[PDB]
């Protein structure tokens, strides 16, 4: 919900401010126009969804969450209906409240995965809608924020509608620390717990991963409590984490990270 709740992504936040907020707030200062389709790409659970909602919140604009997998329906014309409805709703909401409307589409790549054209005809209908967003005469202000963990699955026709493209990265050593401080903050830690060390040990783990680690480590003492009929749980100690790390790997493999940085190298 807010930007300030999002750990890293200081430069992402700025790119979305610059692509969406400042134009919405001051169109008169953008006499050379600006893109309305913004691609967030990266590994899973690193804040593509959060960052999109956080902007919608920053604007207090309407926010419309769609899963691309859900709109691709195996009947001709239901999918078309879906894609038309989305943008229509967006435009109406924008026009009614006189402020922007943000469509967040996650699993975007799923628009290129086959079901029954037909799926091409839906795709092209979507892209037509995209192309329609900047049209000068429309009083509604609609932005599409598209998200995918497999940007490489997007073809050229589809990529050209997304002119702004931000890489949302794994959390770095410093940021993982903030993440750990943040998640761990609501549970009882042993003094022997060294968050700096754990940040080091969590190289390659996604923000959601980190959350799941903390939960899982909290689970060990809670499990103990109940098993032993105690009133509160034992504190979470440094071992507790090591144990859970022994079995939990990064959600993203060394190849994927290259896939991403390669893809990033273009486009
Ligand atoms: N940068 C971040 N700061 C704080 N929490 C994060 C961050 N990235 C991910 N998370 C956590 O992981 C969950 C999934 O994040 P999400 O925004 O869905 O990213 P993605 O679209 O990449 O899956 C969030 O609900 C949040 O708890």
Numbering used by the authors: 97 to 212, 216 to 366
Q: What does the literature reporting this entry say, word for word?
A:
Vps4, a member of the type-I or meiotic clade of AAA family of proteins (ATPase associated with various activities)11 disassembles ESCRT-III polymers from membranes, which might be coupled to the membrane fission reaction itself. Proteins homologous to Vps4 and ESCRT-III are also present in the Crenarchaeota phylum of archaea where they catalyse final steps in cell division, virus budding and vesicle release. Vps4 contains an amino-terminal microtubule interacting and trafficking (MIT) domain that interacts with carboxy-terminal peptide motifs termed MIT domain-interacting motif in activated eukaryotic and archaeal ESCRT-III proteins. Here we characterized the oligomeric state of the Vps4 homologue from M. sedula (MsVps4) that belongs to the phylum Crenarchaeota.
To probe the conformation on nucleotide binding, hexameric MsVps4ΔMIT and a shorter MsVps4 construct lacking the linker region (MsVps4ΔL-MIT, residues 88–369) were crystallized in the presence of ADP and Mg2+. Both constructs crystallized with P65 helical symmetry with similar H interfaces as observed in the hexamer structure and a V interface close the to A–B interface. ADP is coordinated between the large and small ATPase domains and P-loop residues Gly141, Cys142, Gly143, Lys144 and Thr145 (located on the large ATPase domain) bind the α- and β-phosphate groups of ADP, whereas Tyr282, Arg310 and Val103 (located on the small ATPase domain) make hydrogen bonds with the sugar and the base. The base is stacked between the small and large ATPase domain in a pocket composed of residues Met146, Leu278 and Ala306. Comparison of the nucleotide-free apo structure present in the ring structure showed that ADP binding induced a 23° rotation of the small ATPase domain compared with the large one. ADP bound to MsVps4 occupies a similar position as ATPγS bound to yeast Vps4p, whereas ADP bound to yeast Vps4p penetrates less into the binding pocket. ADP binding to MsVps4 induces rotation of the small ATPase domain with respect to the large domain as reported for other Vps4 structures and ClpX4041. Our crystal structures reveal that the β′-strand at the N terminus is ordered in the ADP-bound conformation and disordered in the nucleotide-free conformation, suggesting that this conformational flexibility might be important for MIT domain orientation.
